[model samples]
Target: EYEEITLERGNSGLGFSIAGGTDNPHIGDDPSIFITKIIPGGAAAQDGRLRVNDSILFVNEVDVREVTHSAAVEALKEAGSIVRLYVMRRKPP
Candidate 1:
């Protein structure tokens, strides 16, 4: 399923890490960026909307679906204090 998550950057920052992309695909050959981990007490952790394994499709309106790992990371970093993300969370059958 897909979800739109909005989070405010805490003093420690977004408090999450991402993995996968065109250059390096973590999940099969998908090449989509995924939320690899959520830091304890971080913005994402506190918001509780984002979770590990969630694929990020957009970062603050910037399309990251086909972007490289560095590009996606940059987009997220430049998104500023309040960022909006469109993500897809796969549920196991």
Candidate 2:
């Protein structure tokens, strides 16, 4: 659940709106606040190795449930850079 970041002054520049390939949906007025349920095939949809059902629990190993969207965003960026998730798509029943 992330949004498009444009690089301008900082690491990612001023982002006008959700562009593509990485978007976090939320309810209410908080832009960073993610309250809505995201479908698959979207940016965070876990396209390549990321799955549609997978949910982001923490950013950079830090709990996101308590932190704000700004903090979460930073943590997510840090976490996304180094974190390697292992998902098993094929499970033998």
Candidate 3:
């Protein structure tokens, strides 16, 4: 399933780190970016909408499903303070 999560940037920024992408795929065998870490007390952690292992499908409405890692990074950087993220979370049975 998918989720649209809205996160307001804090003084320390989004307070999360991502991994994987077309150029550096990590999860499964597809080109995708995953939320690798959530900094404690950061925006993501504070909002509690995002979590580690979630695959990011879009950054501020920009499609990142098939982009390179660096390209996805750029998109996130340019998304400004208030950012919207579309992500997919696969729950283990």
Per-model clash counts, in order, read: 0, 5, 0
Ranking by TM-score: 1, 3, 2
Model 1 residue 56 distance off true place after TM-score fit, in angstroms: 0.6
Please give the CA lDDT of all the candidate structures: 0.75, 0.33, 0.73
Candidate 2 lDDT by residue in tens digits, 53-82: 222344344655334556544544554324
TM-score of 1: 0.81
What RMSD does each model have against the real structure?
2.4, 10.9, 2.5
- What lDDT is reached at residue 17 by model 2? 20
lDDT for model 3, please: 0.73
For model 1, the stretches where C-alpha displacement exceeds 4 angstroms are 89-93
List the candidates ranked by lDDT, beginning with the highest: 1, 3, 2
Count of clashing pairs, candidate 1: 0
Candidate 3 lDDT over 1-93, as tens digits, reads 888877787643667888877777775566777777887887788877555776778888788867887877677667787768788654321
TM-score of each: 0.81, 0.34, 0.80
- Give the TM-score (vs. native) of candidate 3: 0.80
